[PDB]
Amino acid sequence: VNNKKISLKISEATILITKVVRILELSSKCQELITERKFFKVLQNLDSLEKLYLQEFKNYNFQFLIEIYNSIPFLQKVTKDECINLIRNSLNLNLGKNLIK
Amino acid sequence: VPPSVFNMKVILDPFLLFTQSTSTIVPSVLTQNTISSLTFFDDYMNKSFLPKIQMTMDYLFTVEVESNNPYALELSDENHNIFKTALDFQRLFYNLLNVFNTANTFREKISYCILDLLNHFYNYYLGLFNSLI
């Protein structure tokens, strides 16, 4: 029970560390998804994030939502942010103009 | 050709140390007494790597087509086009890469870069064979 104590703080410490790691990665993806109507650090910081989470930084098989999220986010964030920005200023193309006369 | 790659112009990492086996088993030296189909260095450096250099040059010219009869920036002029300073950048880059000294330096790698020049004069000849002609 001193080795259940030391074992408890041991695996509690390690699971605290990995919990801090996945907390960091999902925190970064929250920092990505938070950015609406900016579209500029979207590909910059988001593509910086995808270079770590699905990639080498969190490349254990650890979660499902980390794996499916960071594996998914190519087409979702890239295609959705992409065509979001494409139909952005088509709004302005409708707004440019009606002030012709 | 669909440039997946044959290998590349990236044999400069590989093809140094993989000539040691072409010279320590000296291809093919030992290889004791039979009919063994010796060289094999070249035979791909004859066939494969040379045609891969030729078509690799050709696709490299297709990374400077840019679809403009013309447009450019040109501190002194119009200079028509990005095509022009493209083929300047290409032939300057490759003609620093593929040969500097030694003039052959080449089986026909000289004649390869000569063929890149010949294609460039074919295309910018074709612009005048289209706009004027």
């Binding site: 579209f39 500029f40 979207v42 590909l43 992409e82 920005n85 494409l86 952005r88 200023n89 088509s90 302005n92 193309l93 409708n94 440019g96 103009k97 002030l99 012709i100 006369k101 | -």
Partner: protein, 72 residues
């Protein structure tokens, strides 16, 4: 005023992976052009394409004024 500022930054971020990322704006500009060019003596007709008589002096200064600011 900022009439291409969105098109500017749009073309920047989309031009990280140019250029089909901004090629459909050719289509949207051709379409909403073809609405704004239209019509008033119908005037999406300039693609080898009555309504002639739906035009007079106020419609004239209207028409070539509005097309003039379109060219601007």
């Amino acid at each position: 005023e900022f009439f291409q500022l969105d098109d500017f930054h749009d073309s920047i971020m989309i031009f990280q992976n140019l250029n089909e990322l901004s090629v459909l704006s050719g289509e949207f500009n051709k379409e909403y052009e073809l609405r704004k060019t239209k019509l008033m003596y119908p005037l999406i007709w300039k693609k080898n394409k009555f309504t002639q008589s739906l035009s007079l002096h106020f419609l004239q200064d209207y028409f070539l004024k509005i097309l003039g600011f379109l060219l601007y």
